[PDB]
Design a binder for this molecule. Sequence first.
Ligand SMILES: OC[C@H]1O[C@@H]2O[C@H]3[C@H](O)[C@@H](O)[C@@H](O[C@H]4[C@H](O)[C@@H](O)[C@@H](O[C@H]5[C@H](O)[C@@H](O)[C@@H](O[C@H]6[C@H](O)[C@@H](O)[C@@H](O[C@H]7[C@H](O)[C@@H](O)[C@@H](O[C@H]1[C@H](O)[C@H]2O)O[C@@H]7CO)O[C@@H]6CO)O[C@@H]5CO)O[C@@H]4CO)O[C@@H]3CO
Ligand SMILES: OC[C@H]1O[C@@H]2O[C@H]3[C@H](O)[C@@H](O)[C@@H](O[C@H]4[C@H](O)[C@@H](O)[C@@H](O[C@H]5[C@H](O)[C@@H](O)[C@@H](O[C@H]6[C@H](O)[C@@H](O)[C@@H](O[C@H]7[C@H](O)[C@@H](O)[C@@H](O[C@H]1[C@H](O)[C@H]2O)O[C@@H]7CO)O[C@@H]6CO)O[C@@H]5CO)O[C@@H]4CO)O[C@@H]3CO
Ligand SMILES: OC[C@H]1O[C@H](O[C@H]2[C@H](O)[C@@H](O)[C@@H](O[C@H]3[C@H](O)[C@@H](O)[C@@H](O[C@H]4[C@H](O)[C@@H](O)[C@@H](O)O[C@@H]4CO)O[C@@H]3CO)O[C@@H]2CO)[C@H](O)[C@@H](O)[C@@H]1O
Ligand SMILES: OC[C@H]1O[C@H](O[C@H]2[C@H](O)[C@@H](O)[C@@H](O)O[C@@H]2CO)[C@H](O)[C@@H](O)[C@@H]1O
Ligand SMILES: [Ca+2]
Ligand SMILES: [Ca+2]
Length: 686
Amino acid sequence: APDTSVSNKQNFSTDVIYQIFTDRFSDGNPANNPTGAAFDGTCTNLRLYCGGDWQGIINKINDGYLTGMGVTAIWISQPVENIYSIINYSGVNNTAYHGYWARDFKKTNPAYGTIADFQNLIAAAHAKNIKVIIDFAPNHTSPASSDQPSFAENGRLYDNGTLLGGYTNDTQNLFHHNGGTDFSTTENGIYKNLYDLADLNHNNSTVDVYLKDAIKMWLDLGIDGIRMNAVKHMPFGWQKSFMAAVNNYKPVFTFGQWFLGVNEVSPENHKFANESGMSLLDFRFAQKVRQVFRDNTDNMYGLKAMLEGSAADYAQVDDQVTFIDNHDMERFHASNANRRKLEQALAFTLTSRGVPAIYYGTEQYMSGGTDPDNRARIPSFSTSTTAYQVIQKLAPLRKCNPAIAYGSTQERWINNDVLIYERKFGSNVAVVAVNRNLNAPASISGLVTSLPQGSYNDVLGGLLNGNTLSVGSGGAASNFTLAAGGTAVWQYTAATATPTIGHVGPMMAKPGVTITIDGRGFGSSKGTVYFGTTAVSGADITSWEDTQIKVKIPAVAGGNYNIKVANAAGTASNVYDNFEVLSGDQVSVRFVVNNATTALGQNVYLTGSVSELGNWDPAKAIGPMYNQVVYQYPNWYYDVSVPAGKTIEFKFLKKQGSTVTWEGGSNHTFTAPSSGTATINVNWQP
Ligand SMILES: OC[C@H]1O[C@@H]2O[C@H]3[C@H](O)[C@@H](O)[C@@H](O[C@H]4[C@H](O)[C@@H](O)[C@@H](O[C@H]5[C@H](O)[C@@H](O)[C@@H](O[C@H]6[C@H](O)[C@@H](O)[C@@H](O[C@H]7[C@H](O)[C@@H](O)[C@@H](O[C@H]1[C@H](O)[C@H]2O)O[C@@H]7CO)O[C@@H]6CO)O[C@@H]5CO)O[C@@H]4CO)O[C@@H]3CO
Ligand SMILES: OC[C@H]1O[C@@H]2O[C@H]3[C@H](O)[C@@H](O)[C@@H](O[C@H]4[C@H](O)[C@@H](O)[C@@H](O[C@H]5[C@H](O)[C@@H](O)[C@@H](O[C@H]6[C@H](O)[C@@H](O)[C@@H](O[C@H]7[C@H](O)[C@@H](O)[C@@H](O[C@H]1[C@H](O)[C@H]2O)O[C@@H]7CO)O[C@@H]6CO)O[C@@H]5CO)O[C@@H]4CO)O[C@@H]3CO
Ligand SMILES: OC[C@H]1O[C@H](O[C@H]2[C@H](O)[C@@H](O)[C@@H](O[C@H]3[C@H](O)[C@@H](O)[C@@H](O[C@H]4[C@H](O)[C@@H](O)[C@@H](O)O[C@@H]4CO)O[C@@H]3CO)O[C@@H]2CO)[C@H](O)[C@@H](O)[C@@H]1O
Ligand SMILES: OC[C@H]1O[C@H](O[C@H]2[C@H](O)[C@@H](O)[C@@H](O)O[C@@H]2CO)[C@H](O)[C@@H](O)[C@@H]1O
Ligand SMILES: [Ca+2]
Ligand SMILES: [Ca+2]
């Protein structure tokens, strides 16, 4: 199967995701509708259930709406069972129509459907080449009150019907009871309840094994990816350990939700996407596109710097899931705004690196403010809109032109309003030109590209006023006028000669696990695959074809390697770096060091004998650790994914910049649990 196949659960860069708010899409089965106070078929009250379901989606998948648009993956509301409580948030009735208030992750939401329905959804989907991605919110359960258990369902957790426990009288400590977060610090928003939602406690063995068994259920049902909810609000080490279970069992494209403010650039965010096992939603990309194409708060130079920084700050920028809006932002298009602005922003996204994600309704010029106004019923299934035609024209390129799916980004012409960028991958080129100036044309002169000399038709065929391109030798483009608001796409595809790796996934797992290397020029015959200097050939290479390779990770020590390949003839490919070979199965262990005083600005870190602990390299040390919520300074703590049942030796450091101060005396030793979690307490040794 090629890289573009619907079966490729590891690669979503050749795809265009379509995010669906289940309740607000299409109610293909009124029988499952909630009733009375919780329901509103009129969908006039955006906080009540409107009735949308899996059958609605199947119906739309089957009647051509999605496939007509070229959409090739869908991201649906969390399928797990939510509470049934109708909560009055001060004179306003609220339902769990958004699938974020969980109660049982081992069952479905009757409103959406049953397992049978879900299975049918997956079937219908795969049959039309649309991958299926499900929201997943392992952070909390539902709204709860510790004293007032009569409130809602008390954030009660059920394991396939059996009560695990609830928020009040939480003796097992299945939940955290540290109050709510003010988002003041990263540890604050992790060990405190997001709003009033019962915060699950991952250090609890039950919680950890349960959320781990739960997602195996869904991987078993057939999902192609997972959209992790509120990743900045769950311990990171635990999350790596979650991704380890997933990847070491059944690996699937996973991206998390780490909200980034306007103009916000987080290294914490970058690091998470770089060493956690999952990519993330490109808020940086989204906010800047908005700033430039919608709010008019930054120009093309800002979008360009964004593209360049992001491309360097992200180990796998091609795994960041882009967008122009979503359920927590006002919808990109204002009733009063020039529709052409949403149009070019869409084209911009669809032709940019990463994995595009269109919020349901965008293509139908939907507008509205934040929650819940941005969550309305799709007022129309019209394939007769510019946005539609736009997505339909550009979405398919991510499959037929690798330059757009795996390419590099390079600016080739620019000013305050105009931006002409080139996407390149092998003998594949895509040049996109966008002029955000709604009232003025641009005189494009001296534009040079990588396009062979010839004539290139606007792929949008004039739709957004783009034009034909003329490229002489040098890849020099003839002078042209770039219409006010114009957007034109020019492209070229050809067979790649040398082996080129455009993608690899998963990017973190133990030896033996199978991995997918996608690109062009591999050739049909098995060749060689390298994890650093180690060669792997023949058998362990399960399948090999021109655009896709499937091979198991060799038994190399736990470390970070560079994946490379070479066709049968010995020709090597480029290096796809950042691969983490785990030391084996992962378990989340908490590390507490006591009386480790510091100076303001200096923080404690953990280092140890396995690569998961940085192999004694303080540069790769873990942290800094926390001393606010769970334990207080001078006591620091931290949850880390470590090799299961391994006997590890460790010590604590104190860094201030690259400057490090080793804990005194001897190394500590402990043995990781085989399953569940553990807690290692120790005093800092001077
Ligand atoms: O809101 C106050 C504080 O906010 C911001 O601080 C950041 C900081 O930038 C981050 O690095 C991190 O802080 C780390 C520290 O780096 C780390 O050293 C440790 O802090 C402990 C100290 O080591 C320990 O001595 C003691 O801190 C003292 C501190 O030495 C005193 O000087 C005094 O601190 C005050 C600062 O001097 C003052 O500037 C201000 O600090 C800002 C800071 O400028 C800003 O960047 O307020 C504090 C307190 O009023 O008193 C404290 C306590 O006696 O204890 C701390 C830990 O309690 O650990 C933290 C991580 O927890 O995060 C903070 C943001 O929270
Ligand atoms: O180099 C191979 C070495 O690799 C691994 O060592 C780890 C070690 O286990 C970690 O703790 C950490 O080391 C930190 C120390 O924790 C920290 O205290 C400080 O170390 C200083 C020592 O405290 C100090 O005594 C002196 O170290 C001496 C040491 O006492 C001598 O015994 C000698 O060391 C040899 C070992 O005996 C030998 O077994 C082997 O060590 C392995 C080790 O088993 C493995 O876990 O080789 C060394 C000789 O190369 O010589 C040193 C030199 O005086 O000085 C150090 C530093 O001033 O800092 C270290 C970090 O450097 O990390 C190491 C690996 O980096
Ligand atoms: O309590 C019930 C509410 O739960 C539901 O909200 C969801 C969101 O729809 C999710 O997309 C997600 O989003 C969170 C996000 O995880 C969190 O970081 C936060 O983002 C902050 C950011 O951290 C902060 O620093 C600042 O910049 O403001 C951002 C706000 O955009 O908030 C997001 C959503 O509020 O998780 C929550 C909870 O699971 C449901 O949709 C709501 O209707 C409901 O009230
Ligand atoms: O000819 C190469 C040149 O092309 C682009 O420069 C544009 C520039 O963006 C415009 O603002 C204007 O000045 O015309 C120039 C071309 O004549 C690239 O930006 C630049 O890197 C490149 O060298
Ligand atoms: Ca229904
Ligand atoms: Ca949390």
